[PDB]
Ligand binder design. Structure first.
Ligand SMILES: OC[C@H]1O[C@H](O[C@H]2[C@H](O)[C@@H](O)[C@@H](O[C@H]3[C@H](O)[C@@H](O)[C@@H](O[C@H]4[C@H](O)[C@@H](O)[C@@H](O)O[C@@H]4CO)O[C@@H]3CO)O[C@@H]2CO)[C@H](O)[C@@H](O)[C@@H]1O
Ligand SMILES: [Ca+2]
Ligand SMILES: [Ca+2]
Length: 558
């Protein structure tokens, strides 16, 4: 079912690719061969699976960065490294004492900063982090059954875009991360949401005095207690049960939250969610009125939120505030781009505005910090549109430099046991991505962990045309963790650092060599592909202007 390999050296025909008498390096082994009769002979080093990464021996350093050859490392900051354990319990947040499925584990920006050398060793040149912005303080019911408390550990339940989340760290912590990353040629990307704000939690209701309960006086104190968030589900109750105590009819009480002008939600005297992608409510999340031309003022509950950096601005719509608040971080810190969540659930004008502003903001920060600035490159924005494939969609005309490619995960699944089965996908992609760019992944928090490969995931992802997204732990086969009654939760398991420094050391070393080779050769990401014809194993060359690389896979050893 797959090309085979005797295990002996390979004699490769390089006639058309490399020059006569020129030296060629297998980057994986360090072995150098001279061309004579348009031919070279090399043994794939042990632990290579029969890989040769063939380059001109001239090659000495990484190539100048291009987004079309980018290696993005996507990290859920909470589930990576806990640098500072003091911030793990911000806003009264608690571990669940069970399997920690949907709690803050305590991973933070400081801890992420401590591992930038590790990321650089993999040839990572862009770091995409979960939103570090202030989330909802409390929890909701986790999964269909409500078997775990679900906190905003993933950065998708935003409360205040103008502030950092205390669990992630301080303005100092974020500045150190961005500056240490930029010193290592690693761009910073923020996960950004504009579609929705987080659910109503007991912690936020109590702190910012919005919504209504059915419980009054001392019956309230008996049930919820001093801090309503400390409530545990009782006998014949699930973590969803607390919603039985919340009066979602109270018009005057729920207006004290975002306000009728800010969100569509099926609550009190608010405009109910629409029927189309733009105005519908995803999973009963408050849908932000991004299309509204109505001057909104600030969210009503920001009245009881003195720590906010949000200020009322004349003529400003909810959209204007959101693009403003997100742009501020770019101007202040030099954030190189955004990964945009739920791109299909927000009108295109909103995304264009965000891009215009974020682009101006990055240009400003680079002007004002020319020693720190990597280069004069514009702000990069990529989008999540569910089911988006390899296609120059309308998104590319309204401020997106690349959309996330959903199709590569399942295409690469058909090549898990056999690397050569990807060739038809790579030919298609290398050709179409001469005119535009996408961000392809094997694993995501929304889909599954690509583990059916083993260490072959390294070559499937890192040799793919266009930008590639390593999901944290891809390099270490981070196992799908406990998930309860939500099937996706296990995709966000803790980073398996014990395996990185143990049984998965071989795999990480493999990822490091491929990723470094990718960082040296824009042809991988950008080049036209010529698949070679050999009775001895699978192979291709990629050439893009200056750069030229040949990648040979010998096959299955036995
Ligand atoms: O905070 C604002 C919202 O508050 C109220 O919604 C509650 C619900 O009462 C809870 O049930 C829970 O929602 C869960 C839900 O139990 C679970 O089934 C799933 O929801 C599905 C839904 O069944 C399905 O029909 C479709 O719409 O997809 C949904 C998402 O998969 O997941 C939900 C959350 O994980 O929590 C919320 C928040 O406390 C109130 O009724 C809402 O009107 C309001 O917007
Ligand atoms: Ca921490
Ligand atoms: Ca919407």
């Amino acid at each position: 079912q797959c090309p085979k390999w005797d295990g002996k050296p390979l004699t490769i025909d390089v006639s058309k690719t490399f020059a006569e008498g020129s030296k060629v390096r297998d980057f994986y082994s360090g072995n150098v061969a001279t061309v004579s009769g348009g031919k070279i002979t090399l043994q794939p080093a042990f632990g290579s699976n029969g890989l040769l990464l063939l380059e001109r021996a001239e090659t000495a350093a990484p190539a100048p960065f291009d987004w079309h050859n980018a290696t993005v490392y996507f990290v859920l900051t909470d589930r990576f490294v806990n640098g500072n354990p003091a911030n793990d319990n911000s806003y009264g947040r608690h571990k669940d004492g069970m399997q920690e499925i949907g709690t803050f584990h305590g991973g933070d920006l400081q801890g992420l900063t401590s591992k930038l050398d590790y990321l650089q060793q993999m040839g990572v040149n862009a770091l995409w982090i979960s939103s570090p912005l202030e989330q909802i303080h409390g929890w909701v019911g986790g999964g269909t059954k409500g078997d775990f408390p679900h906190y905003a550990y993933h950065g998708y339940y935003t409360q205040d875009w103008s502030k950092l989340d205390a669990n992630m760290g301080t303005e100092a912590d974020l500045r150190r991360l961005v500056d240490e990353a930029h010193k290592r040629g690693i761009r910073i990307l923020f996960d950004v949401v504009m579609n929705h704000a987080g659910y109503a939690t007991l912690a936020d209701m109590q702190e910012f005095q919005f919504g209504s309960l059915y419980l009054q006086g001392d019956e309230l104190k008996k049930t919820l207690g001093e801090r309503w968030t400390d409530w545990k589900p009782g006998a014949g109750q699930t973590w969803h049960s607390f919603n039985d105590y919340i009066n979602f009819s109270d018009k005057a009480g729920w207006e004290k939250w975002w306000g009728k002008k800010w969100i569509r939600i099926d609550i009190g005297d608010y405009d109910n969610p629409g029927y189309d992608d733009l105005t519908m409510s995803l999973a009963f999340l408050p849908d932000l009125k991004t299309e509204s031309k109505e001057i909104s003022g600030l969210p009503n509950f920001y009245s009881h939120k003195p720590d906010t950096a949000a200020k009322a601005i004349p003529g400003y719509t909810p959209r204007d505030y959101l693009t403003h608040w997100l742009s501020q971080w770019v101007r202040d810190y030099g954030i190189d781009g955004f990964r945009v969540d739920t791109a299909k659930h927000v009108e295109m004008d909103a995304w264009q505005q965000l891009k215009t502003q974020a682009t101006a903001a990055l240009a400003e920060w680079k002007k004002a910090n020319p020693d720190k600035a990597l280069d004069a490159a514009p702000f990069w924005m990529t989008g999540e549109a569910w089911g988006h494939g390899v296609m120059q969609s309308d998104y590319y005309r309204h401020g997106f430099d690349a959309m996330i490619n959903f199709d590569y995960q399942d295409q690469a699944a058909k090549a898990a046991t056999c690397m050569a089965n990807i060739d038809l996908t790579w030919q298609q992609m290398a050709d179409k991505l001469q005119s535009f760019n996408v961000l392809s992944y094997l694993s995501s928090h929304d889909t599954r962990l690509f583990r059916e490969g083993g260490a072959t995931a390294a070559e499937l992802l890192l040799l793919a045309p266009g930008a590639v997204q390593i999901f944290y732990g891809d390099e270490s086969s981070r196992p799908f963790g406990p998930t309860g009654s939500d099937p996706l939760q296990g995709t966000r398991s803790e980073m398996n650092w014990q395996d990185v420094n143990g049984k998965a050391a071989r795999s990480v070393t493999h990822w490091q060599k491929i990723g470094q080779f990718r960082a040296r050769h824009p042809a991988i990401g950008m080049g036209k592909q010529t698949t070679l014809s050999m009775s001895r194993g699978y192979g291709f060359v990629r050439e893009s202007g200056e750069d030229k690389v040949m990648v040979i896979w010998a096959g299955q050893q036995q």
